Design a protein around this nucleic acid. Structure first.
Lengths: 169, 123
RNA sequence: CCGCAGCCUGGCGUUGUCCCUCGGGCGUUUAUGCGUAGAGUAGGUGGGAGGGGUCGAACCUGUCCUUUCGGGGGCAGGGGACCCGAAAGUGAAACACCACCCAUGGACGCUCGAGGGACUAACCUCUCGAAAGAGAGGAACAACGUCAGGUGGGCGGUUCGGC
RNA sequence: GAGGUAGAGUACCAUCCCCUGGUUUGGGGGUGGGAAGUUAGGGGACACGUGCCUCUAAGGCUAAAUAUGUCCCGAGACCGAU
RNA sequence: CAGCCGUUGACCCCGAGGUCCCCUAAUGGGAUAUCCUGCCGGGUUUCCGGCUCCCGGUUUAUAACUGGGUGGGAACCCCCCGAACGGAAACAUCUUAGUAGGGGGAGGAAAAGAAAUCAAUUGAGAUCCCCUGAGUAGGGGCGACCGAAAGGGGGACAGCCCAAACUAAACCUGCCGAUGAUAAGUCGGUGGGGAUGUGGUGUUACGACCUCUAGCCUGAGGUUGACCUCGGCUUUCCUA
């Protein structure tokens, strides 16, 4: 159970954070979306069923912090709905992470997500991303459900875990 | 890297590779980290191997610290791909353990002496 | 009548490392105390007539610091072993041992200020570089996010009594 | 009988905002902190404590029972060429 | 008007095919042209195949090459963003209202679906919708108004996989050939992926599950009352 010990170092606070700060800088040089051949903290990915068998992949993405990117209105309005400061994107950043991530590889599908690091200017997450067209996963009894259409593009309708979380179940 | 504390010379590493490959038939050797850590947690480890080319560094970063209080020696090898070949595995290996040194027991003990005397100089 | 942009200031986060004077502390390190009556330094409360005793004391002789030079406190040798009383006073006694508080100073790892300084590794600006990456200046500031306060007909909704 | 396992920036907390009856009591998000994790936790109308009761998240996936007429059969106290 | 097809079975209707121009999400490249115009490979006269963003392979580590997410659809569905009109006899909180509308994405239904559920004398037992509960609870210049849940009564009522402890290469997968009914599967060679974890058992609360210890407990065989190997059984896949 390495996965038990991976976060034993990094459970809430460790000097591991100093190392990641170095990784934090270099990632800002990296593209806002990229592919990593091996997922970082398997304790989450395997906890979301990721299998190192051929047909899965890992993706990193970053986003900017702050309140909602909402424009000020201009027409005739009552004061109730016309303020600006204090707004926030109602659906969580954990949710938004997969969205742009989903668009990147439409021939695939999203399952789960998590962040790994965060500074005051960006949030960095990691998302499982699955090919369903692969003639490997096509014959899995353990995931035969995916052969159906309905499992597609789910993250956009909020049927992922984040979506369920955003819906507060 | 940061998960490694003391440097290990190649010649010391080279002997380990010869040491482990001998254990392919006589000794009992653990392959894959899960088969190691619990055995290390089981305090049944005589000697363990930690790769110098792990990615990310945290994948095996716990192993040295746990072996401290468990008082079980550990060794480093730069080329983890070789170790996978060394353990007769078609792919890379990052963590292997020595339940019994099999035939290279004396070779193992010298290595233990080799590392421990360096540890004394490693403070 | 008001509301919201934007603006100014400040707090929090992106926020790092050496410091530096002083004032605060945090958890520690230690050491320093006379209203009168009295063998005499009772600072004030506790368990406590036993505590120290080759499980080292009384005596006097000096080197030394201090203080209301009152006087006590710390030094080994000379001395190989002795003093306080349950006994005399004090609206409150035992320099009988060990504790708590006030009070003086220094130091240790950490924190905050009056602040100040320095650096670069964050980050920012620019350049080179196909990329990778490199170089130059500022700088933990700035800028952003967020929050608060001040301003705010720049923009938004409104009323503008009744006889 | 003995031993082991049992999902983190997740719960939870402060603050700002959003909405819903959720009101000193709900859910979501931003922001800042931030756990335990089986000898664990949560919940049982303000808070806290005590007992008593019941569940185990932070990953899945799912038959049917209902939403509708681009369309096709059938029926009609629907009109007869403004 | 004129002529033909039809008894060698017409026309029609059913099914199976064949053809099936151009633009068009239009995708070789370009478009204010429903049009022009390249590069490869094929045979070759006519002509035929391939050429944004991705997934996994060939070959050098950037060159091309093997093999498979886009738009529409009457309403309906899901999810983010998000109005004023009016009402309060004015109007600013509130309400009108998450509707009008924007964006994304599906299917024939979608959504949701196995409690950190309730309620309360120790009970029930996924979800959904229908009728009630009920304008009750509760919210608000206490103003218009908004507005549950629990329970009961109906419909169909189905409940299984993962992570961990624990097994540890016993694993999945491309092609070719054989076999197999062409299926699935198996076989021989092949290529890929994989200890940075595949596959095996199993996921539930006064506990569940796994391992060890001890004891009792299957048709054949063996082994040392006990143990083991081969039986039926559970799950899954495959369609002739």
């Amino acid at each position: 159970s390495m996965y038990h010990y991976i976060e034993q170092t990094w459970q809430n606070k460790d000097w591991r954070r100093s190392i990641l700060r170095k990784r934090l800088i270099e990632w800002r040089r990296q593209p806002a979306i990229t592919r990593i051949d091996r997922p970082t903290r398997l304790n989450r990915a395997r906890a979301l069923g990721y299998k190192a068998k051929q047909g899965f992949v890992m993706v990193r993405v970053r986003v900017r912090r702050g309140g909602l990117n909402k424009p000020r209105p201009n027409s005739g309005r009552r004061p109730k709905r016309m303020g600006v400061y204090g707004y926030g994107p109602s659906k969580g950043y954990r949710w938004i992470a997969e969205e742009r991530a989903a668009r990147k590889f439409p021939n695939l599908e999203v399952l789960g997500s998590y962040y790994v690091a965060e500074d005051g200017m960006y949030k960095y997450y990691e998302v499982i991303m699955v090919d369903y067209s692969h003639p490997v996963i096509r014959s899995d009894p353990e995931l035969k459900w995916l052969q159906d259409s309905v499992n597609r593009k789910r993250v956009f309708r909020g049927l992922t875990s984040a979506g369920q979380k955003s819906r507060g179940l | 890297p940061s998960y490694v504390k003391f440097e290990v010379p190649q010649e010391l590493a080279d002997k380990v590779l010869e040491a482990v490959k001998k254990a392919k038939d006589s000794g009992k050797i653990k392959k894959g980290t899960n088969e190691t850590t619990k055995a290390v947690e089981r305090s049944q480890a005589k000697l363990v191997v930690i790769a110098e080319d792990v990615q990310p560094e945290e994948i095996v970063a716990h192993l040295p610290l746990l072996c401290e209080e468990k008082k079980i020696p550990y060794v480093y090898v730069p080329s983890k791909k070789s170790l996978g070949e060394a353990c007769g595995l078609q792919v890379a290996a990052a963590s292997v353990a020595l339940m019994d040194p099999g035939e290279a027991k004396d070779l193992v003990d010298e290595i233990v002496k080799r590392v421990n005397e360096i540890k004394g100089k490693s403070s």
